[PDB]
Amino acid sequence: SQTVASHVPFADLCSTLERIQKSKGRAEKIRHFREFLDSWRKFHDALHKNHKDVTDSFYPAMRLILPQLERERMAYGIKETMLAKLYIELLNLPRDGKDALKLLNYRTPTGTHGDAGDFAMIAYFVLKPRCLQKGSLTIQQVND
DNA sequence: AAAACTATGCATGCTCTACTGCTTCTGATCTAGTCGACC
């Protein structure tokens, strides 16, 4: 029961999403998405040459590209505030430190750096010096 | 009549077992806030 999702690094999907976001018009975004889809379909055809009945599809990447349409998964129960709290606890950052305060009151523009309304940007800035440069996770592992 | 052996009461030290006070862990309650989904 081989699945293409187990052979696709998550970094590739992240890079594709970043390229789509950092695009001017619809044409470039559609081109990038179509290139990714064609690569996935070619890999699917190559992998499943012999097997007859296959349940493998593009769902593993689709459920991440469009999280709002996910129905199989239940509510995560965590939003910006809970995620910031968990990041503070796990990273062992000081409670009263600058990073923790920035993460908690992310809407306050007191920082004057990055973005004062996008929590993901601040999380990325905080984690830049505390995280490696290359990942080792696949789409299937992230879904699990 | 004098000397040697033995008995018993009290002093001394040590060790072991209740009782009171201080410190720390656990449980129960309340109050404040967060997340889900809809309209």
From Swiss-Prot:
Which tissues does it occur in? Testis, thymus, prostate and heart.
Compartments in which it is found: Nucleus
Q: What function does the entry list?
A: DNA ligase involved in DNA non-homologous end joining (NHEJ); required for double-strand break (DSB) repair and V(D)J recombination. Catalyzes the NHEJ ligation step of the broken DNA during DSB repair by resealing the DNA breaks after the gap filling is completed. Joins single-strand breaks in a double-stranded polydeoxynucleotide in an ATP-dependent reaction. LIG4 is mechanistically flexible: it can ligate nicks as well as compatible DNA overhangs alone, while in the presence of XRCC4, it can ligate ends with 2-nucleotides (nt) microhomology and 1-nt gaps.
Task: Describe its partners and assembly state.
Answer: Interacts with XRCC4; the LIG4-XRCC4 subcomplex has a 1:2 stoichiometry and XRCC4 is required for LIG4 stability. Component of the core long-range non-homologous end joining (NHEJ) complex (also named DNA-PK complex) composed of PRKDC, LIG4, XRCC4, XRCC6/Ku70, XRCC5/Ku86 and NHEJ1/XLF. Additional component of the NHEJ complex includes PAXX. Following autophosphorylation, PRKDC dissociates from DNA, leading to formation of the short-range NHEJ complex, composed of LIG4, XRCC4, XRCC6/Ku70, XRCC5/Ku86 and NHEJ1/XLF. Interacts with DCLRE1C; the interaction is direct. Interacts with APLF.
Q: Which family does it belong to?
A: Belongs to the ATP-dependent DNA ligase family.
- Noted disease: LIG4 syndrome: Characterized by immunodeficiency and developmental and growth delay. Patients display unusual facial features, microcephaly, growth and/or developmental delay, pancytopenia, and various skin abnormalities. Severe combined immunodeficiency autosomal recessive T-cell-negative/B-cell-negative/NK-cell-positive with sensitivity to ionizing radiation: A form of severe combined immunodeficiency, a genetically and clinically heterogeneous group of rare congenital disorders characterized by impairment of both humoral and cell-mediated immunity, leukopenia, and low or absent antibody levels. Patients present in infancy with recurrent, persistent infections by opportunistic organisms.
Please give the name of this protein: DNA ligase 4
Q: Which organism is it from?
A: Homo sapiens
